[PDB]
Amino acid sequence: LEAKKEENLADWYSQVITKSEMIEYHDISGCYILRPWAYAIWEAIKDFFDAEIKKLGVENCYFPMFVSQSALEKEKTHVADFAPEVAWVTRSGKTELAEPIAIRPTSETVMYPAYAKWVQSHRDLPIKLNQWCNVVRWEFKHPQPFLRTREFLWQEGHSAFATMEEAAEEVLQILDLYAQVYEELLAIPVVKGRKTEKEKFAGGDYTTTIEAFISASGRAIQGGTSHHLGQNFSKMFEIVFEDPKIPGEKQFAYQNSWGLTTRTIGVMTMVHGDNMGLVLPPRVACVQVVIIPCGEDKEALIAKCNDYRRRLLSVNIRVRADLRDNYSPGWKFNHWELKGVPIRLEVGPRDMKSCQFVAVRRDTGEKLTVAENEAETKLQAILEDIQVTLFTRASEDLKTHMVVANTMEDFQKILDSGKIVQIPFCGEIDCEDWIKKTTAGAKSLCIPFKPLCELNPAKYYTLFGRSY
Amino acid sequence: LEAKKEENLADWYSQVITKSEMIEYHDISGCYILRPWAYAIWEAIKDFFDAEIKKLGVENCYFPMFVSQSALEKEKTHVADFAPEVAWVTRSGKTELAEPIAIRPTSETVMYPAYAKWVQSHRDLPIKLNQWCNVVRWEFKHPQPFLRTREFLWQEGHSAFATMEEAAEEVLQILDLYAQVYEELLAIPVVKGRKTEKEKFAGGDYTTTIEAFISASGRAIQGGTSHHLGQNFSKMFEIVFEDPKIPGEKQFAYQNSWGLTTRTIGVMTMVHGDNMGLVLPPRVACVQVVIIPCALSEEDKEALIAKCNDYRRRLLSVNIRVRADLRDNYSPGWKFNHWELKGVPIRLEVGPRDMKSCQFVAVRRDTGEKLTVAENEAETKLQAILEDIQVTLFTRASEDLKTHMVVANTMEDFQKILDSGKIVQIPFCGEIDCEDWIKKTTARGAKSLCIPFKPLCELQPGAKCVCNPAKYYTLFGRSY
Ligand SMILES: Nc1ncnc2c1ncn2[C@@H]1O[C@H](COP(=O)(O)OP(=O)(O)OP(=O)(O)O)[C@@H](O)[C@H]1O
Ligand SMILES: Nc1ncnc2c1ncn2[C@@H]1O[C@H](COP(=O)(O)OP(=O)(O)OP(=O)(O)O)[C@@H](O)[C@H]1O
Ligand SMILES: O=C(C[C@H]1NCCC[C@@H]1O)Cn1cnc2ccc(-c3cccc(F)c3)cc21
Ligand SMILES: O=C(C[C@H]1NCCC[C@@H]1O)Cn1cnc2ccc(-c3cccc(F)c3)cc21
Ligand SMILES: [Mg+2]
Ligand SMILES: [Mg+2]
Ligand SMILES: [Mg+2]
Ligand SMILES: [Mg+2]
Ligand SMILES: [Zn+2]
Ligand SMILES: [Zn+2]
């Protein structure tokens, strides 16, 4: 790794994702291969999130990727602005299809026709379905791995309820899991908030979000989304049930939808990565500890490495013994640091017979000598501390880089020196357009649930910044 | 359920998959919704296979679904008949794309250009990658849920090796896992074999396969596929390395690919399904035991529900997947039939009389037998009944395949045996021209299923084909 983050972030990012073996490029613009190292992080997030929404009663399923042409039109599910992003299939082989067929950019138009046929009474509610799947958005915006890709993997949850109280409660439960994914799995702090009228999903009532800060850019990014849809889609698609008390009266279902993507992995990369490459938070590292031998008799050195064995596996630590004879120790050192392995355990002959080893933390660079039989306890303590270290530096960097302005003067003074700032806000769109072009430019990120301090007149303190 | 499996198979199948809540229909022909009841089975297969290939050193990844026109134009990875099955993206919104992009029907052309860049020396091998992903094949044959769908879910594994002996061993380990998915998870027996030259993947060296039999059809089906590709694809795609100890000879990697799909769930439905609905093998049933509570007081009623919720915890604690149906708006008789249609292996009936007699009742979905159990043996005995349901389901389907797969040595007995809804092992040339002949002669058709590794009888000392001498016993039959 030779590019440096603070000077050229784009090229640093591209060289970390490649030299960590996370991403391989493809010959289609905005499409990336997720190699096992990148995919294992996604799998870990999936394991966590899946387990959580299962306690909420959500069930997994799989809906078609193709949407019929007339099911896309149906109503103002999308105002035509979102239409350029939709890829259309028009032939199989050379045979032009009777009607063109669309590639899921989201699955409302595929799912809700089915909800309307499953809901024949209030006993059929709630419906709570989730799917892990790929989606295609023909993004015009300049493409980057995991940040802005043309195909990505995600989960989209879609739930329908008899009452507003239930739907409204889920929206905030899901948003909290998203925050837990980022803050507890990925050691990235986030700001919960609600979208302004400009930035909310046109198809919903309100849109909640979690926002993250990437210092080296000075830019924020939407990490996850949870919408209350009210009855916007229920009336559109006729998901209706009989009023239990009033004969002949249909009442429309209340709906939510929520989504999280592999953009998580890029954000973790942009947040924790350093000038030596990736840095993996322990709770998602598929290798938390790598064993590397340093320095015939030698077979005793490999038996000692392989005695860390289960001694680490038996304490349920993900461990890799890199015993390959074909690479130098120094090669292994740099190879696993580029991949972001939280702890390097080096065994040298000196230490086999002094019944010691050395551990090197990927965040601090600290090298530490441990008694041979203190491996289990102290290694666990280091991996827990690395996690807390990584979340603490990212917390204290968001504290530093998120401040207040009450004037356009100091908001602008502060925006352009790499800052995101909460400002009092009209709340109206054309004002938001106006702030967008003056500072060029800043978007609205979210109206925080717990803003700075207590507050056309200002309706809300709203967090502003340049954003992906 | 209204249709009967024996009389009209399609409508019975259509009504089992829907009224069990496995499938919802879509407005695109050959595309189907996988509702939780069916998707949970896929997740169970996924969990097993994933563990197994992890021991073989295979790692999971995700490659793009889009294939460039120009990457598809470089190599010849497929014969010309497969080109129609490819769906093309030709515009975004209203803007026609400069070059069209194809939807993955399989991922050789997407992956192997990357393999070529990752492989620069012998220490870069082996490469062992797997992906769970969706695939589109614009099928001409008649589409049926989970049997033959235009979009499906699958796993495709692609591995690259330095030596031929490594590749050759993976092919059959993988195949044996497929047969394990079928025989141990779904209680379906299968026939391992090699495809004839006609039916093998044209661009590889040889194709191994497992075939399953659907009695009610008299039809067999390809349940899984494992290819040895030799070096046909390493030469096309230039996956080469130099060995320092073999100076001056270019080493092309030895490759395999293998695939298994949600056709699994369709086969399970056809094999074990009955005229009361789905029949779930305990090992993939996402609910193995359903607890149903079956006037006097409201405090008493809460105690009945507390006992059901105490059976649920005792059963989770012995790792039995359990759902307590505590919905108050349905009768017990209703819940009884609803969970039978869904194929739940065991119904647990708890009533007030059994609560104070410290008993419960279990009824098996495979035989229907009702059993009163002491409250204390719930964990031990319920576990035993699920293990016996599994063994029963696999035993009956085995005893149905032995019955329905026989040997014939004349085209004349081959025809009569075929026409009684059976699959036939016949002595066979192996040549393509002949295979077309059997196909239409038996229509006035039967195709080859596989060449069994362990055929019923040993062939030859110069035994002649059913035409040219016989090379091998070949398993022939009508097929999905
Ligand atoms: N092209 C993309 N690649 C990866 N992740 C994405 C992409 N577009 C959106 N996401 C993520 O998926 C989630 C789904 O939200 P959605 O796409 O509806 O919001 P959006 O307002 O279009 O977002 P954005 O400004 O990121 O395009 C978002 O929270 C975001 O983090
Ligand atoms: N349209 C489909 N829907 C579901 N599963 C399929 C479909 N086509 C193939 N499969 C399954 O995918 C596996 C691997 O795919 P492969 O290309 O080897 O099949 P195939 O030879 O084309 O199959 P088939 O003879 O059924 O057309 C097969 O073992 C089969 O079980
Ligand atoms: O995905 C969501 C909201 C929510 N869905 C459920 C998961 C969470 C997500 O936030 C809207 N959306 C975002 N980016 C889009 C691009 C195109 C279209 C589009 C274009 C034409 C027709 C059509 F039906 C949809 C929708 C898009
Ligand atoms: O899928 C396999 C082999 C194996 N892959 C690895 C997983 C297991 C599978 O058996 C060949 N094949 C079968 N059905 C096809 C339809 C179209 C094309 C095709 C591909 C590219 C371009 C094109 F025009 C057509 C290949 C197909
Ligand atoms: Mg977008
Ligand atoms: Mg936006
Ligand atoms: Mg085929
Ligand atoms: Mg075939
Ligand atoms: Zn204003
Ligand atoms: Zn012959």
Numbering used by the authors:
A (entry chain B): 1016 to 1310, 1318 to 1462, 1475 to 1489, 1500 to 1512
B (entry chain A): 1016 to 1309, 1314 to 1463, 1475 to 1497, 1500 to 1512
Q: Could you give the paper's own sentences about this structure?
A:
PARS1 is one of the aminoacyl‐tRNA synthetases (ARSs), which mediate the covalent ligation of amino acids to their cognate tRNAs for protein synthesis (Kim et al, 2011; Kwon et al, 2019). PARS1 catalyzes the covalent linkage of proline to tRNAPro. Unlike the other ARSs, PARS1 exists as a part of the bifunctional enzyme, glutamyl‐prolyl‐tRNA synthetase 1 (EPRS1), which comprises glutamyl‐tRNA synthetase 1 (EARS1), three repeats of WHEP domain, and PARS1 (Kwon et al, 2019). PARS1 is a homodimer formed by the PARS1 protomers A and B (Zhou et al, 2013).
DWN12088 and DWN11251 bound to PARS1 protomers asymmetrically (compounds with asymmetric binding, ABC), whereas HF, DWN11748, and DWN11761 bound symmetrically (compounds with symmetric binding, SBC). More specifically, protomers A and B of SBC‐bound PARS1 and protomer A of ABC‐bound PARS1 showed similar structures to each other, whereas protomer B of ABC‐bound PARS1 was different from the others in terms of the binding of both ATP and the compounds. The electron density map of ATP in protomer B of the DWN11251‐bound structure was also unclear compared with the others. Protomer B of the DWN11251‐bound structure also showed the decreased number of hydrogen bonds compared with protomer A. When comparing the number of hydrogen bonds of protomers A and B with each compound, relatively similar numbers of hydrogen bonds were counted in the complexes with SBC. In contrast, protomer A made over 10 more hydrogen bonds than protomer B in the complexes with ABC, implying the flexible or weakened binding of ATP in PARS1 protomer B. Another ABC, DWN11251, had a ketone group in the bridge, unlike DWN12088, and the halogen substituent of the bicyclic ring in HF was changed to a halogenated benzyl group, making the structure bulkier. In protomer A, halogen atoms in HF and DWN12088 showed an optimal distance to H1093 of 3.36–4.26 Å, and the distance between H1093 and the fluoride group in DWN11251 was 3.22 Å. On the other hand, since the distance was very close (2.2 Å) in DWN11251‐bound protomer B, the R‐loop was not stabilized due to the van der Waals repulsion or steric hindrance with halogen atom, possibly resulting in the unstable binding of DWN11251 to the R‐loop in protomer B. Overall, the flexibility of the A‐loop and R‐loop in the PARS1‐compound complex structures seemed to be responsible for the different binding modes between ABC and SBC. ABC showed relatively wide margins and gentle slopes while SBC showed narrow margins and steep slopes.
